[PDB]
Write a protein that binds this ligand. Structure first.
Ligand SMILES: [Cl-]
Ligand SMILES: [Cl-]
Ligand SMILES: [Cl-]
Ligand SMILES: [Cl-]
Ligand SMILES: [Cl-]
Ligand SMILES: [Cl-]
Ligand SMILES: [Cl-]
Ligand SMILES: [Cl-]
Length: 302
RNA sequence: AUGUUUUCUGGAAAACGG
RNA sequence: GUUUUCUGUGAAAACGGA
């Protein structure tokens, strides 16, 4: 076209403004005291900003890299927004409330492990049992050992495996889930998905505490989280931030960032992606400037 | 990072088959 | 080609020396 240069100039201006947030004080948490002048931008955010800033927008290859970098920055931004907004003291309560609202339940690390191993004792041979019969089998063995357990709560553990698509009036375990390691993984993954859909962001260390009551299942939880990551993850995470914000009313109007974030999520990150037009380059960089500006402002004020 | 872990990603050997 | 044992390389991600 002949607007190519003009698009370049706007794109360059966006990147210039973003680069200012990497300067030692521009993103300070608070200027009241030297001890609080640390940047609000996490190490991943700073890495991803440096990567974008380094893109040569005067070369096609540089423009392709800038779009990938804009997408990566925007996806991390949603996570940072959720994390800053998130109330650590209400986290476990919001998690179990989300689980229980779906008629599911996590009885606790020792009780849940036992419930699942009992389900396997009944079903690992391929038997197809009615729900009432399976629940009864589990309750008769579990309840004397864990008096807090009940027929109602075991039914909820069974519903969680059901909602996790582990089965198939009659319940039969899929062949792939007829071992404890496989069944437990799918169970754990379902809880993580419930948490994410509730707008929660929980790290592998805390997941290990919540689901296992120790710190020796971090890599396992990290594995689960990573297998849930797809190209659709960024767009869904935008909708999940919305849930998190509605839990408290969104006084900062973070919801205004939605269209910009959704534009970024629509960026095709694959290497077989056609280079961006100049228009797409400008729009993408405006969007990522707007959201990073949004994040920094949110943290510095809240 | 000559640090920890995770996701995706391609060769050796053993036995068998044809 | 099937099954088993053992193992490459690269890209990316989280944690993180801070
Ligand atoms: Cl340039
Ligand atoms: Cl470049
Ligand atoms: Cl919260
Ligand atoms: Cl829910
Ligand atoms: Cl629960
Ligand atoms: Cl327990
Ligand atoms: Cl713990
Ligand atoms: Cl671990």
């Amino acid at each position: 076209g002949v607007e190519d240069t003009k698009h370049y100039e706007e794109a360059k201006k966006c990147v210039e403004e973003l680069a200012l947030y990497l300067k030692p004080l521009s993103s300070a948490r608070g200027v009241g005291l030297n001890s609080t002048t640390q940047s609000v931008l996490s190490r991943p955010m700073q890495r991803k900003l440096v990567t974008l800033v380094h893109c040569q927008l005067v070369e096609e290859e540089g423009r392709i890299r800038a779009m990938r970098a804009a997408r990566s920055l925007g996806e991390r931004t949603v996570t940072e927004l959720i994390l800053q907004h998130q109330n650590p003291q209400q986290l476990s309560s919001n998690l179990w409330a989300a689980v229980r609202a779906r008629g599911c339940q996590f009885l606790g690390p020792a009780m849940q492990e036992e419930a699942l191993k009992l389900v396997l004792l009944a079903l690992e041979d391929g038997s197809a049992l009615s729900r009432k019969v399976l629940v009864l089998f589990v309750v008769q063995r579990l309840e004397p050992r864990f008096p807090q357990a009940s027929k109602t709560s075991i039914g909820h553990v069974v519903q969680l495996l059901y909602r996790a698509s582990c089965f198939k009036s009659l319940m039969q375990l899929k062949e792939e889930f007829r071992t404890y390691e496989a069944l437990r993984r799918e169970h754990d993954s379902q809880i993580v998905q419930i948490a994410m859909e509730a707008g929660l962001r929980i790290a592998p260390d805390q997941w290990s505490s919540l689901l296992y009551g120790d710190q020796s299942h971090k890599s396992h939880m990290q594995s689960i989280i990573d297998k849930l990551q797809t190209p659709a993850s960024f767009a869904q995470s935008v909708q999940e931030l919305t849930i998190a914000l509605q839990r408290t009313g969104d006084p900062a109007n973070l919801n205004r960032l939605r269209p910009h974030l959704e534009l970024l999520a629509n960026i095709d990150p694959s290497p077989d992606a056609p280079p961006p037009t100049w228009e797409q380059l400008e729009n993408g960089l405006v969007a990522v400037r707007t959201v990073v500006h949004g994040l920094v402002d949110y943290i510095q004020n809240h």
